Every structure is written in structure tokens, then in C-alpha cells.
Amino acid sequence: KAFDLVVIGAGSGGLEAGWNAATLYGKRVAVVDVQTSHGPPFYAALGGTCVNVGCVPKKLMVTGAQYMDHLRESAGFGWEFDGSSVKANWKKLIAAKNEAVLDINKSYEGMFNDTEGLDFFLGWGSLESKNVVVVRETADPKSAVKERLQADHILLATGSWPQMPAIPGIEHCISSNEAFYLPEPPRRVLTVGGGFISVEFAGIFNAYKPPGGKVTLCYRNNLILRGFDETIREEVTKQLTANGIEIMTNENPAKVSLNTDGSKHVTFESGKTLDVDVVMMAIGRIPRTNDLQLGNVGVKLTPKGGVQVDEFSRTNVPNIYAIGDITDRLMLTPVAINEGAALVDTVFGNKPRKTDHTRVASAVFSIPPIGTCGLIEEVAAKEFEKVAVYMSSFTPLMHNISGSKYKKFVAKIVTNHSDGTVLGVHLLGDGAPEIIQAVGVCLRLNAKISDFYNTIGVHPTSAEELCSMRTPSYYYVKGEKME
Amino acid sequence: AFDLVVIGAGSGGLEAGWNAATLYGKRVAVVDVQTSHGPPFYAALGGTCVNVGCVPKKLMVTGAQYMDHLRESAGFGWEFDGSSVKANWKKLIAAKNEAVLDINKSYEGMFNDTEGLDFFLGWGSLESKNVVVVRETADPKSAVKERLQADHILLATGSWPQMPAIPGIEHCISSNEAFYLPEPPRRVLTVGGGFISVEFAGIFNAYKPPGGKVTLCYRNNLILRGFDETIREEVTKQLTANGIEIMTNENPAKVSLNTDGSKHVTFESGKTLDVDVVMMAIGRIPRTNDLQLGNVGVKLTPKGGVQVDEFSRTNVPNIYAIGDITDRLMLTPVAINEGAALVDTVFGNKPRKTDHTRVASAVFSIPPIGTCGLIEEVAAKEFEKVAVYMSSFTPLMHNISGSKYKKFVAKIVTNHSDGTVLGVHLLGDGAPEIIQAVGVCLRLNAKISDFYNTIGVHPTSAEELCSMRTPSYYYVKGEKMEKLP
Numbered sequence A: 001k002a003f004d005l006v007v008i009g010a011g012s013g014g015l016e017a018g019w020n021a022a023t024l025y026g027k028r029v030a031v032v033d034v035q036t037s038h039g040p041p042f043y044a045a046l047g048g049t050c051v052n053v054g055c056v057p058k059k060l061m062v063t064g065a066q067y068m069d070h071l072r073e074s075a076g077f078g079w080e081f082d083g084s085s086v087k088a089n090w091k092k093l094i095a096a097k098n099e100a101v102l103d104i105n106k107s108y109e110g111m112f113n114d115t116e117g118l119d120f121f122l123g124w125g126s127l128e129s130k131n132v133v134v135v136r137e138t139a140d141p142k143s144a145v146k147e148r149l150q151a152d153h154i155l156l157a158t159g160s161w162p163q164m165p166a167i168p169g170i171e172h173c174i175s176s177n178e179a180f181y182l183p184e185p186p187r188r189v190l191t192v193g194g195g196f197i198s199v200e201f202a203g204i205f206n207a208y209k210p211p212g213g214k215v216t217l218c219y220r221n222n223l224i225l226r227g228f229d230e231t232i233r234e235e236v237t238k239q240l241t242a243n244g245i246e247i248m249t250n251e252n253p254a255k256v257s258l259n260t261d262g263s264k265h266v267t268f269e270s271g272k273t274l275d276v277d278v279v280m281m282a283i284g285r286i287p288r289t290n291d292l293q294l295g296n297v298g299v300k301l302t303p304k305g306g307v308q309v310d311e312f313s314r315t316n317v318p319n320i321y322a323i324g325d326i327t328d329r330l331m332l333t334p335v336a337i338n339e340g341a342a343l344v345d346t347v348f349g350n351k352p353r354k355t356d357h358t359r360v361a362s363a364v365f366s367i368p369p370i371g372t373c374g375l376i377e378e379v380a381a382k383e384f385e386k387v388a389v390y391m392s393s394f395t396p397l398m399h400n401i402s403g404s405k406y407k408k409f410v411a412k413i414v415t416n417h418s419d420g421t422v423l424g425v426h427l428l429g430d431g432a433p434e435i436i437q438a439v440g441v442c443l444r445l446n447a448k449i450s451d452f453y454n455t456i457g458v459h460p461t462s463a464e465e466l467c468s469m470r471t472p473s474y475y476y477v478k479g480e481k482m483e
Numbered sequence B: 001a002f003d004l005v006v007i008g009a010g011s012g013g014l015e016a017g018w019n020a021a022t023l024y025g026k027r028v029a030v031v032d033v034q035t036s037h038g039p040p041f042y043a044a045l046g047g048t049c050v051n052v053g054c055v056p057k058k059l060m061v062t063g064a065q066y067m068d069h070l071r072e073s074a075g076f077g078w079e080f081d082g083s084s085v086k087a088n089w090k091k092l093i094a095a096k097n098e099a100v101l102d103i104n105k106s107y108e109g110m111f112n113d114t115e116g117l118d119f120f121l122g123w124g125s126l127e128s129k130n131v132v133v134v135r136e137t138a139d140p141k142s143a144v145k146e147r148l149q150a151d152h153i154l155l156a157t158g159s160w161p162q163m164p165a166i167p168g169i170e171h172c173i174s175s176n177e178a179f180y181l182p183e184p185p186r187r188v189l190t191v192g193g194g195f196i197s198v199e200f201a202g203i204f205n206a207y208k209p210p211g212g213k214v215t216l217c218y219r220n221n222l223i224l225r226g227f228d229e230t231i232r233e234e235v236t237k238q239l240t241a242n243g244i245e246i247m248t249n250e251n252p253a254k255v256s257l258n259t260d261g262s263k264h265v266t267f268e269s270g271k272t273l274d275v276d277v278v279m280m281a282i283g284r285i286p287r288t289n290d291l292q293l294g295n296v297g298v299k300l301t302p303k304g305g306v307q308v309d310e311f312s313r314t315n316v317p318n319i320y321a322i323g324d325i326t327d328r329l330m331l332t333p334v335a336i337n338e339g340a341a342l343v344d345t346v347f348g349n350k351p352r353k354t355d356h357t358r359v360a361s362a363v364f365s366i367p368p369i370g371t372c373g374l375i376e377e378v379a380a381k382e383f384e385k386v387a388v389y390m391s392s393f394t395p396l397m398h399n400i401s402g403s404k405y406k407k408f409v410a411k412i413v414t415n416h417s418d419g420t421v422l423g424v425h426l427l428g429d430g431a432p433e434i435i436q437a438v439g440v441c442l443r444l445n446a447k448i449s450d451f452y453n454t455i456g457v458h459p460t461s462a463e464e465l466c467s468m469r470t471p472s473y474y475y476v477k478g479e480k481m482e483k484l485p
Ligand SMILES: Cc1cc2nc3c(=O)[nH]c(=O)nc-3n(C[C@H](O)[C@H](O)[C@H](O)COP(=O)(O)OP(=O)(O)OC[C@H]3O[C@@H](n4cnc5c(N)ncnc54)[C@H](O)[C@@H]3O)c2cc1C
Pocket: A008, A009, A010, A011, A012, A013, A014, A032, A033, A034, A035, A042, A044, A045, A046, A047, A048, A049, A050, A051, A053, A054, A055, A056, A058, A123, A124, A125, A126, A157, A158, A159, A160, A176, A197, A288, A291, A292, A323, A324, A325, A326, A330, A331, A332, A333, A334, A336, B458, B459
């Protein structure tokens, strides 16, 4: 049939775009996805990666993982129970997560049923012609044509996909996609990658591992979580270690084979070896463009595989747009959502708007978690003559009593010292993701450190640290650190 | 002889003291009655918050939270013998005691490792407008430990629980004794609808022995006057859902010791109840008496708090009052801000006034409140058109947790004329942490569109603040309605 807009991918960005165009601009909209509910074989489905195999399940599972800390920490506050009766039933967690995800899948289905002028098509979308999306049975372009959709405008919103290194024994390794469906919690697991997904999963597995289990995280580079504040990177390495995770830095899997008992035998380029039940590859995500047959319309790609866009999410081909991870800009659900909103307003509203990819509040659901917004000091040091760093690090009192004396809360404010303007705020510790949200609004309003210090604290909180730093800890002048 | 003499080594008194000494190389004496926490005088070096307020309360509310975490864990697949679960109150109090003592010791450190700054022990009162007398007791006619000369005198003696003069008030405790109970009460009546009564009901609720019952009574119809109405009704539910009994329109007429040591409480409605503890938390009042304010003519207010202008100045030159003795917003960070402003003014020659508007604060209820600025009722009497944005969802984790009663409430009250945020009110896990940076937003004159144009952090409760674009209703010239004309 004929549509004002065809969206390929029913994810974070695609549903924002498709709903807005139908409901706010009264366009006739078609959206395509490969599955109506979560899990094998295509993992992402109606709802997107975040709903099905990202933010949503992972948050529920980290929340589950956090009770390992609460059960132990309760004792400092005089809670007593039979420690030897304690089991982390991973099957109950997964079943709980699956229902939660299926409920979302179902509500999106009902949304398509209940919303006139917004139509779902199941299967594989690809570009036939610059105004025709073909929906097929499989990813294979030979496969049978379920639909052919005439389209004034086409939005590519197919998101990203885990990266698997071409090494021998790749086949004995999983991504985060399979991790969400492990039938049993691995006794020993290697997470491969120093990024948020490896770290967040190392925490999940560490809490639900059967007795005498072990979690190992490996990263090629010296220090996990590049892109994050360096003090936070080092402090989070220490606090993961304190909770019994083995962080193997400057190490990479050369090869995986099977022990005769089917457990996975890891050889690191360093001549180290490890035997584990699971190797989870979390080394990167690449934009999903192969199946889109973008050759048929000549949509400009990067070598990486990303769809190249201007600031308004417009491709080199007019009437064809891309938003979300497929653009390989910032791979976060609220950024994809913002891109979809901004696009539809631009194209169908004539309310021209670009997404601002700077000063984007984000979190890592590590144990403990990270909250961050804006520049780290190294980046700011290259762009500003004078950078001030305000830093407060302290084990909070609750965590003297709790027994987790290692759980130091870190708060860091990075400023342009020439005028006090806050460039970056970086938090590690319980509450960090909740604290940082309204800090996003502060940086949109060009808050200065005097706007933080002059704000009266909420006490007792971790957050009030942000409002109690009067004096820099150190500086960068012309890119050079100075204590 | 001292540049500054401070009566009270509390939240307000120490900030002024340390700032004066370390920023303006001034010479400061601080008076308090006690060097560490607990009986006989409860407050000590560090003040009410450190010794018998925010600090031990937050530790004890954190303890209480484990009752919820242990239950909730099951939804995520945690399995243990529920029948083995015990709440060792005695452990909690010992742990709290050690935590507070370390802070008492931390503050003694500060006075030591700080030149000019020196602690004097005993009771401050005013002899003359430039001489403080540290006595041995709260009797004006006890020995004179010291005579102190003062170019400037700061009054920071804080507040004190009010005990309603009913028959058998000697059988009741304040929050002061609640912190040192040797055993957790099985039956407890917390008297009052304020944050202290509500917080303590939560604590007693988690540590009560088996067959236990926490009852909260309030003299009027709805707890937490001065907080957002939606939140007041919601907290009331969630406390009920967690087995706390809320008695509204009820107030004790008297208390009698039963022969077994328990308390027979007779209400005004004629209702009775037996409880192991009656904790009165009906209000706190400024510690004005033991200063002798007849004896230099400092003027109190129609409510008993030291009268101050915006610079914390009394009618008497050289004499200031900050914190709870001023009987305004009884919060530690307000005391601290006042003290910092006073010293930056008087000694720093950088005059600065505390902003008593747009103050972020919290109730460590289970679950907690975080709030900053005007509730809609107040806004609606000041602004022609007021918009209320409201989102109330049980967050997903509390589907699986089994605590479906834990609804997160996010309210933004705006000036609808220009969209300026007047108030933000949160109920739910994380509300006190969420609200701090909301305080900064309101100082920067954040509009509702600064919130909704900010990209959310997903998944959080906080991101709901950045997802509200459409008012839920309005007040127009004081009048509530779904729609504008
Ligand atoms: C483990 C994990 C955890 C994450 N955690 C967070 C977090 O906590 N917070 C956060 O903000 N971000 C998080 N992210 C990132 C977030 O999930 C993504 O940024 C976001 O989902 C991308 O939205 P999008 O619209 O670009 O694509 P997606 O939401 O991934 O949507 C793409 C959709 O397109 C479909 N599709 C693909 N190809 C085709 C085709 N040819 N035809 C039809 N349909 C197709 C897929 O089935 C999928 O549903 C996480 C990601 C992962 C993997």
C-alpha cells in the first residue's frame, strides 16, 4: 500500500518517529520489525533492543544482582538470617524478566491495533526503490515478499548488533543477546570487553553464580570503561575487585576451545589460560545495514557500516532518513527517541530541530553504578585554556556500618575555570543514575559551579556533595595538569 | 577575647566557626554542653543532626529498609529461610552509636588541628551584649567555667522536642530517647504527622519483635502538612500497605503506666491503646531559655524564635541568630547556609543572605519524599495561572518485587504564564537523591521546557521529570480545572 512514512525497525527511535508522525502530524504510517516478541532467533523485536535485550531486562537483572550486596549489608544494621539457606535462583529472575519483556511486547502490539494510521508489518524490511520498502520472509533477499510498501518518506531505524571477533572458537562464545536467555547461571564466565555491557553483565553473573563460581572480565587496554571519568574508571575497577570479580586488563582472547566436559577453554594472547562455562563477547555493536539492501537506492554508508546523516538525520537520498544506533552517533535509547522526535517535527512539522549529542546524561548499572553528563577533564583540557576539577571521594557512613567500606562515592565537577561554567559531572556510587538526571537540566541551563555551591544541600544524601565543593582539587592550564 | 563567640557547636554554629577561623583568620570560641552524643543532654559537639537527628536517623531508616529488601529479593529469585529472619535492634543502636561517636571525635579533631578555633564546654548565656558566660549547668546561678569577650556573638543553640503537658507525659519519650532504646518496642505510638513521627514509624515498623504493631496518630485529617497533597495521601497508603496503622483526627488526652510497665494511652475521642512506647514528635521549639534573653534584650517572635532580619541580625548590634533557634525551616543545610552567609557578610565583607525559597529537602519515609519549592495550593494563591504536571507509575522493579503499592509520584508545579518551575515533588525510592540537582535547576529559573527538552537517563525514575510536556490540570485565579478557558 501507500504510506506517508515507512519505518524500518520498531525500536526506541522507530516507534517515537512512527507514533509522532501518525498521532501528532496525522500521517499514515507503516513500521516493520522481524518479531512481535522477545528472544531467539532474532532477539530484538517489537519494542527494539532496549525493551527486548537491553536497558529494560538488564536493569531488572542488575536490580536482582544488587540483593547479593543488600543481603550481606543487612547484617551491619543487625539483620540476621540463615546465610547457608541463601540461593540466587537465576531461573526465577529470567522468568520474571521474560514476563516483564513479553508484557511490553504485548502493549506495543495493542498500541498498533488501537492506533488508526499506524500499521505494523512483520518480517524483513529492505529498500527496493527510493519510494518502495519491500518486506520479506527472511534476511535473505531471495526469500518470499510478504509486503511491498509505497513510501513518500522512509526512516531507517534498524539499530545495531553485537560485534564478534573473527577468532578460532568464536562459535563457542555468545553476545549479550544469548546472555539474557542462559537457562542456568554460569559457575565461571569470562566477560570480554571493558565497556558498559561487559561490566554490567560481570556484576549480574557475579551475584547469581552458583557456589565457588568465578566471574572474569578481560579488556585489551590498561583500564576499563574508556570514555568515562578516569578516577571513576579506577575506583569502579577497585570496587568490582572488592566484590570478587577478576579484572584481566591488557588481555584479549586469542582462541576458545572445549574441555572434554564441554566447558570453554580460553587462551589469551599473553599465554594465560582460563576454563569457564560461558565466554560473553561485549566488544562492540555495529549498525545493522547489511539486510537493508541500501545498494538499491545508493544511501551513503560509512566504512564502519553506519548510515551517514546530517544533523537533521537526513541521508544523501532525499525522503530517506536514519536515526538511532544505525547512525553510529550516541548509542542510547533516549538519544534514538530524541532523533526520531526531531526528524518527524522537521519533516512533517516544518519545526526544524536537531538532537544535541553534547551534555547527554547517561549511566552505567555497574555495582556500584555510574552517572555522567558532559565532558571528562582530559577532553575539556584540550578545548579550554583553564579547566578546574572539583572532587569529593569518601566511603559514605551507611557503608562503614554495612561492611562495604570499599564503596567510595565519587563526585567530580569539571568547569571552564575562566568563567565557572560546568562542562562535566561524573558520579560513582549508589544513586548516581538518579542524581545525574536533573544535572542534565543544569548543563542545558549553562550552570556554573557557583550555581551548584550556592544551592542548599539535601541532607543526608550522596547528591549534596555536588552542592558542597567551593574550591578546585586541581586544574588543567593549556592542557597540562597542575595540583 | 575572641573576634566571634558561638553558643552551640551544631550544624549552624560549626560552619560559622570553621569559616571565620580558616577563611578570615578570625579568633573563635564555640560553646556546647557535651563533647559526644547521648544522655543527659543528647545534642553535643556536631549538633542535633550529628548526635540525635539526620545522621543516626538516616542510618536507622537504612536499617529499616532491609525489611523491604529481604522480602523484595524473592521476586528476583533470592531464596532463604524467611522464618530465620530477625532484626537485631541492639546491633543497629551499637553500630549507630559507634558511627556518631567517630563523628564527635572527627569534630574534636577539627577544633584541635585548627588555630584560633577553640571549644569551651558547658552552658552559654548572655551577661552583656559583648560577654558570654560559660556556666557548669543550665542554672544561671552555677559556677562560671569562663568569661568570654566577643566583638561578635552568634546564637546557634538549635531546637528541642515539644512535650504536650498532658497527664503521664513523664511515661512518653521524644526522638532523643528513641535513639537509645535498649530494646525495639513491640507496640509503639508515634504522636505527630511531621517527618520525625513518619520516619520513626518506618524504623519501629522494621525492627518490631514478632506480634508487633506501629501506630502513628495525628491531631488533623492528613499527615505531612506542608508537603504536596498527592504525596501526603500516597505516603499514607504505602505506610498502611507496610502494616503501619495511621490514626488521623486523634490525639492523646493522657498516659498511665499499666502494672506490667506498658502505657495505657487515652485519646481525646475516648479511644484507648496499650503500647510499649509513646514517642511524642508534635514539634520542636527554639532553645531560647538557657541563653537569658531578658538579660541583654534580644527580641523573640510571637512564636519564641530569636527575631532576625535577612542577614541573621537580632535587634542587638554584634549579636546574630542562625538555624533552628530562628524557628523557620528546621533543616541542617539551611543552618549551614545561614552560618556561611553570616560570616561571609560580617567578617568577609561580602554581604550575602540565605534564600529560604526553593530549598530541596527530603523525608526518609519508606518510601521517601524529595521536594523543592512551592506546592500547588501555595503557588495558586500567588500566580494567576498554575500548571500541574503529574506522573504516577509503579516502577517495573516493584511489579516483580511484590511491592506493587510502591507508586513513584513526580509532580512539577509551574507558573503557566511563562512555564517557570515553581515546585517539584517526588515520592519513591531515590526521590531525595533525584531532588538535589532539581534545587540547582530552580535557582537557574528552569522552565518546564528545560526539563522536557533534556534527554532522559534510561532506565531511571528521574527521567520521568524530563517526559512531562502536557499539564494534568491547572489553577486559574486560585480555582482548580482540567482545562484553561
Ligand atoms: C545489553 C544492552 C544494554 C543497553 N542498555 C542501555 C541502557 O540502559 N540505557 C540506554 O539508554 N541504552 C541502552 N542500550 C542501548 C539501546 O538499547 C539502543 O541505543 C537503542 O535500543 C537503539 O534504538 P534504535 O531505534 O536505534 O534501535 P533498536 O531499539 O535496536 O531497534 C531496532 C529494531 O529494528 C529491527 N530490525 C533490524 N533490522 C531489521 C530489518 N531489516 N527489518 C525489520 N526490522 C529490523 C530489530 O528487530 C529491532 O527491533 C543498551 C544496549 C544493549 C545491547
